[PDB]
Symmetry: C3
């Protein structure tokens, strides 16, 4: 049966500059009054399922077991692509479109049970075809939060029926990797190079010192370091790296002695 998950972790691409995300929400308190709603972010680039998926990766680990991860970038709203409900190995519940959005969250804690959200009893009637995020995803997330059995949302599916996004691995060739994501607020660059395969040379060619933290080099100076995810990163001490060297997600990066 169901279990109370009092904490809803809410992620979308509708922004926080208008009421859309708050309505969702209004709906969620209606179903689950006791729930604590927490925004992950709503400022995922429009339709960008990959970026949303990347933002969700560290969520399962950072959040307690009584969490409903509600992911809501759904450009396929009102079409054949369904919403899915998942229970992971930590015990957390997650709800979102079966479009690859939960890919990296499930890498952190794998799927133990999944179901397609097909039952109207966990939906917000009547369902608007252009707003599945509110009427299906958010509504279902609140029902599971209130303690609804996972089985009641719809029929069981295999974990392989969950759409997964491709993630490129770094390999020893020197080690070649790529830029996965830029830390928007600061301009730091994150790579897919783990601890793990490792003054070094990074290829434009640069000689960068490897540090434990930002303040080990002078203000404005570049550095290499390992982030919280065990991956290699580039930054300027108290400055914006991608304003000096404008890299984009997907670009190659090679590290050699």
């Amino acid at each position: 049966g169901g279990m109370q998950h009092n904490l809803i972790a809410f992620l979308s691409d509708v922004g926080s500059a208008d009421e859309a995300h708050a309505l969702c929400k209004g709906v969620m308190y209606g179903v689950a009054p006791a729930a604590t709603i927490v925004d992950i972010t709503h400022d995922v680039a429009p339709f960008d399922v990959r970026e949303g998926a990347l933002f969700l990766a560290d969520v399962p680990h950072s959040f307690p077991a009584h969490t409903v991860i509600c992911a809501t970038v759904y450009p396929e709203t009102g079409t054949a692509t369904h919403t899915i409900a998942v229970r992971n190995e930590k015990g957390q519940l997650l709800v979102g479109p079966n479009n690859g959005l939960l890919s990296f969250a499930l890498d952190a804690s794998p799927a133990v049970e999944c179901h397609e959200v097909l039952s109207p009893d966990v939906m917000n009637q009547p369902v608007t075809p252009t707003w599945y995020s509110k009427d299906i995803v958010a509504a279902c997330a609140a029902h599971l939060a209130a303690g609804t059995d996972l089985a009641a949302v719809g029929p069981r599916i295999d974990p392989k029926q969950i759409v997964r996004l491709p993630y490129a691995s770094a390999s020893e060739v020197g080690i070649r990797g790529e830029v996965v994501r830029i830390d928007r607020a600061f301009g730091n660059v994150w790579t897919n190079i783990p601890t793990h395969l490792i003054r070094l040379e990074v290829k434009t060619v640069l000689e960068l010192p490897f540090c434990k933290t930002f303040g080990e080099v002078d203000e404005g100076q570049p550095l290499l370091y390992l982030n919280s995810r065990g991956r290699l990163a580039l930054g300027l001490n108290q400055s914006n790296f991608i304003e000096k060297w404008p890299v984009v997600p997907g670009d190659s990066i090679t590290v050699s002695p």
Copy 2:
């Protein structure tokens, strides 16, 4: 007498980029510790009472009955224009400046009882003339949330004494309407044409297919559809419509066979 409304729905134009909205809030927890504060948005254009009012329209329906709708775009702060407190037909309470801000929220669920907020016992002493939003609107919203009788805020007024913003209707002439609001995050255009009066022709003249949802046309292609509010809308499938055809609120739109 009063009734507990545990959920505060908070809307302003002060943004979320500094502490202003959080102070409000600090004040609200002081009066009502048990209250759950939820932002509708704070990114209403400065002084734009119309935009704020549009953001509030779907709030009464989306939110449960134990909600205090706290609306806070108040360029008339410290002048003769008072704050009002309202109880609607759903049972929800709403507080804001009598400047037209609650207009469209009251269209959704009409006013059953109204009072001007004049009593200092529901205010945050001393009241700063430049911050009525915090010291009167937010403070009063928290008092009503805690269970304060509506009558205690100040003297009763007639619903007609509530300032209302004009809303232009769409009419059959072909059907002529206007652009009411642009969906900032995606670039979708919303019109005032209901379900209801309706490949069609939209006047620059365009031939657009009428769809149930975005993904019924190819990526980048334009479409016509009905939104959650039962009104006609324009969009590009996974793209920004007002970047292709830059329309602004108020502009005419005619739909013919």
Copy 3:
């Protein structure tokens, strides 16, 4: 011993455009499930300790006594500069880097007891050198919120060992002052001139009327007024002042009859 502080007031520079601030947070609910987390703001300019400190000034007064003020602009993360935990005269608890961030908050309500956060039992193991904000500041803030004794975080220090940021006073010379902060959302200018030392002349030279509130002058017209903090301010009635006269923090301002 410790006391429950159920309300966490959370301030950072990591923005709300991605998951970073929400992870912090995830961590906080893990330690303190009953806690109510409230964002002050996350849109403090990168590394800008001064701006963050200014945003915190009015927080102690606006917020109740059971608040943990969690301040998190920490460019010195992973270096010798430690996190500190403070209990002020109001009874509130505050946690942040000993880099000047809590300076103006402590001006409002002075430090009664302080400790450096050195114990791992109030931290999030293992601590990432690049994320002290999450693993030390946010974790410790949640522990104190749950009721952990202030003494348990680490060794006691003197209040003078707390780094303080310099604040320039306005003086009678006519009264000379400076621009402290610009009200981002509206364009209003705040000065360091108190009530207190005061149609007036403001030096480019302008003749401005002194008003109680914005609407005492015609739309678009400039005015002088006192803000909620008892300090002199400049603005345009329903317009953006720094778009007409582009002043920056630090610039001189002289007021004479």
